[PDB]
């Protein structure tokens with residue numbers, strides 16, 4: 001019934017060039033079995049979307065990595081939002097929704113846009129930059145920790161902790177095990193900054209604590225919800241912005257459309273999230289025997305979703321391998337779908353829009369002038385280095 005494949009979606013060969021293997025996974029059937037890790041997989045849009053929108057059957061409380069929390073100990077206390085099912089998930093979800101709300105975006109937009117314009121101006125003075133370290137990393141590092149209300153000391157732990165979190169969703173391979181081995185200094189830093197005394201008033205972190213009054217969360221839950229934003233809100237945006245810059249360098253015709261209408265900035269970032277999804281894969285666990293696309297999956301089985309594959313599925317998208325900044329992108333799963341759909345997507349979009357708007361208004365060309373290096377992660381997709389020359393407009 002279910003085809004068995006030996007493709008390892010957590011191998012460097014797969015990270016290097018996942019597209020061909022993803023077509024193989026999509027075309028083999030709606031549900032495959034991956035013998036390498038003894039998990040089910042779904043690579044088509046329809047099944048990925050269906051799994052995401054059935055949290056009762058495909059739960060998150062048993063972890064969204066390979067590890068099954070009913071069988072193995074989590075490497076850190078479970079997330080109160082990501083690794084929770086309704087109804088436990090509902091109230092921490094509503095709090096983060098209100099912290100990361102439209103009204104909060106109105107308060108940070110001017111500073112985020114000023115910082116993005118200032119960065120592009122700074123980068124234009126140097127001409128030849130690394131679009132990862134000097135842009136995709138430097139810009140969110142200059143707005144997000146300040147938006148959280150973090151102190152200055154110790155921010156070098158932020159990206160390492162994030163890379164650890166997303167590597168840890170993988171199998172016990174060298175990427176995951178190495179990350180955990182070096183994790184103690186990053187965990188200590190992050191956990192300490194999650195305490196209310198260490199969070200600046202007016203920031204995202206202090207606002208989470210300020211919601212402990214309402215009956216939605218208690219004070220003992222607030223540090224873990226701060227930890228959620230420090231886990232999921234930095235490295236994802238770095239890879240998203242890097243993907244957008246990468247796309248604009250590979251598709252100069254799309255950079256030229258963006259220059260002619262900077263108001264396409266928000267959709268050009270959204271298309272980059274569909275085209276080069278920063279988070280390529282993660283898991284659900286079945287809570288019972290379920291039929292999916294004509295196949296029966298037993299209870300307590302891990303199901304690997306290929307989000308980047310669903311976003312390139314020609315059963316859903318026309319010309320899926322083309323970066324199109326006027327594409328109707330609604331429905332892509334780059335931010336998830338359903339009750340867990342990225343609660344910080346307004347922050348991601350704001351960061352990405354104002355950066356691409358700054359590029360649209362100030363940059364004439366983006367040419368790759370050096371070797372492009374990929375950054376390897378069990379679930380994140382992004383570049384290690386992207387040497388580009390920026391031609392000022």
Ligand code: HEM
Pocket residue numbers: 060064081082083093096100228229232233234236237239240241273277278279282333334335336337339340341342343344345347348
């Ligand atoms: C390009 C940027 C981003 C991408 C591609 C992305 C992707 C995702 C995806 C796919 C999920 C769903 C996970 C699941 O269903 O198991 C998710 C959830 C989440 N994201 Fe994002 N994210 C981004 C930016 C952010 C930012 C900026 C924040 C916070 C400031 C954030 C915080 C969270 C949190 C807390 C969750 C858990 C929500 C829940 O379980 O209900 N992410 N993200």
Ligand SMILES: O=C(O)c1ccc(-c2ccccn2)cc1
Pocket residue numbers: 079080081082083165227228229231232236279282
């Ligand atoms: O609550 C946390 O700590 C946390 C929340 C969300 C993520 C995540 C996972 C997969 C894709 C995107 N984001 C990771 C951690």
Ligand SMILES: [Cl-]
Pocket residue numbers: 076187190191
């Ligand atoms: Cl931790």
